[PDB]
């Protein structure tokens, strides 16, 4: 019992693993159509909206009355967590693309058809660090807030976006579960 057409999805049999490159048919299916999921990034106003959401968050948290350090740390953590949830958590497309063709890539890896260090990727890398530098001037006298904020930033907003973590899946038993490699 051997299949004439092998289109079967494997799972990671290790702890640290990489998603396997695609074959000829898979590449053709991916390149047949412009990806409707990761093309809005390059259009008019995307960078500006990334700027504006931060200002809105700042005004909201300032409305909650609390001291500058608390408002700024809340702004930083909220933006970083939201960006991670939107761009790095869910893999696939929210609509039927093809035979599926992107069932094991997140939205971050889909940008600019997997071309690294493009201007947009550079901008989205720069934003977290400058946001940390701006907020650094207010809770600088508290070791706990400073350390926690720096940890959250460097570990959630700069590491997943690095060029060495591309197509990197970490699969532990009891939490993440078996990842998808083929």
């Amino acid at each position: 019992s051997t299949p004439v057409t092998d289109h079967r999805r494997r799972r990671a049999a290790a702890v640290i693993s990489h998603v396997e490159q695609e074959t000829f048919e898979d590449e053709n299916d991916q390149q047949m159509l412009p990806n409707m999921n990761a093309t809005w990034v390059d259009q008019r106003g995307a960078w500006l909206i990334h700027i504006v959401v931060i200002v809105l968050l700042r005004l909201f948290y300032s409305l909650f009355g609390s001291t500058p350090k608390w408002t700024w740390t809340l702004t930083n953590m909220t933006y970083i967590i939201g960006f991670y949830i939107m761009f790095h958590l869910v893999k696939g497309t929210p609509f039927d693309f093809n035979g599926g063709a992107y069932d094991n890539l997140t939205m971050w890896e889909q940008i600019n058809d997997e071309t690294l260090y493009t201007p947009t990727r550079k901008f989205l890398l720069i934003v977290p660090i400058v946001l940390f530098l701006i907020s650094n001037q207010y809770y600088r006298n508290d070791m706990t807030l400073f350390l926690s904020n720096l940890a959250v930033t460097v570990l959630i907003g700069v590491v997943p976006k690095l060029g060495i973590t591309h197509r990197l899946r970490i699969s532990i038993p009891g939490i993440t579960g078996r990842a998808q490699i083929s």
Binding site: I126, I129, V130, F132, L133, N136, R140, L150
Partner: peptide, 14 residues
């Protein structure tokens, strides 16, 4: 160390 961290961050930005 604060100026040190900020300088490191500027370097990594570049």
């Amino acid at each position: 160390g604060h100026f040190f961290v900020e300088g490191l961050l500027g370097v990594v930005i570049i």
